[PDB]
Amino acid sequence: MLKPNVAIIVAALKPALGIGYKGKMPWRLRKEIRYFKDVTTRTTKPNTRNAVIMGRKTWESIPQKFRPLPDRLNIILSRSYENEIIDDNIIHASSIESSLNLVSDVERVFIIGGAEIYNELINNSLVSHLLITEIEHPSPESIEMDTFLKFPLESWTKQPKSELQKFVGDTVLEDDIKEGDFTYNYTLWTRK
């Protein structure tokens, strides 16, 4: 596949855009996990699937029995990897672009994490869309976090919900979802 449009999908706590603590999300938002699954899995073209790209540490963090993520082509990046097709669901690669050369019959491509991948790939011009779940909490500071997004958002535009709706198709988008003390909303951003 040549120069596909890629999207980053991430969940971050405002205002600092904290994303994790010692390799894990500092929250358990059950509806947000469901949205992540639907968005990354759904396709509109017939014999296609979507691809998910992740860093080797994220891959390793998923319990062996739960990988690869079903119904999507999983791509794992490592600087030590050779560009190789493991099976029909798993690709190893050392760069995003090299990995995309090995795919066909893919509709959308999503970067799913983790912290290092996000922070490095936000600056690759293949990235055209950000799907950011903006999480809010009454006392952000009480949540322990060690990793943060370092995104240049001054170079990006938050679109209206109609545009997000158009992006996700059939997926139901509820507003101000509450789970425990967290409130969140789904957003779409594109480059200026």
Within 79-138, the residues that bind ligand TQ5 by CB under 6 A are 112-115, 133
Question: In whole angstroms, how close is the CB of 44 to ligand TQ5 at the nearest point?
Answer: 20
DSSP state of 30: H
Q: How many residues bind ligand TQ5 (CB under 6 A)?
A: 17
Task: Select the binding partner of residue 37 from ligand TQ5, ligand NDP, none (C-beta < 5 to 8 A, by kind).
Answer: none
With a CB cutoff of 8 Å and minimum separation 6, the contacts of 70 are none
Say whether residue 114 binds ligand NDP (CB under 6 A): yes
Are residues 10 and 114 in contact, defined by beta-carbon separation less than 8 angstroms? no
Within 92-111, the residues that bind ligand NDP by CB under 6 A are 94-95
Say whether residue 115 binds ligand NDP (CB under 6 A): yes
C-alpha span between 107 and 20 (Å, rounded): 29
Task: Select the binding partner of residue 166 from ligand NDP, ligand TQ5, none (C-beta < 5 to 8 A, by kind).
Answer: none
C-alpha span between 44 and 14 (Å, rounded): 32
With a CB cutoff of 8 Å and minimum separation 6, the contacts of 91 are 51, 73, 74, 75, 76, 84, 85, 99, 102, 103
Torsional sign, CA 27, 172, 164, 35: positive
What values do phi and psi take at 30, rounded to 5?
Answer: -65, -40
C-alpha span between 56 and 45 (Å, rounded): 29
Say whether residue 10 binds ligand TQ5 (CB under 6 A): yes
Task: Select the binding partner of residue 11 from ligand TQ5, ligand NDP, none (C-beta < 5 to 8 A, by kind).
Answer: ligand TQ5
Residue closer to ligand NDP by CB (options 93, 164) is: 93
Annotated binding site for substrate: 32-37, 72, 112, 118
Residue numbers at the binding site for ligand TQ5 (CB under 6 A): 9-11, 19-20, 24-25, 32-33, 36, 58, 112-115, 133, 147
Residue numbers at the binding site for ligand NDP (CB under 6 A): 23, 54-58, 77-80, 94-95, 113-117, 120
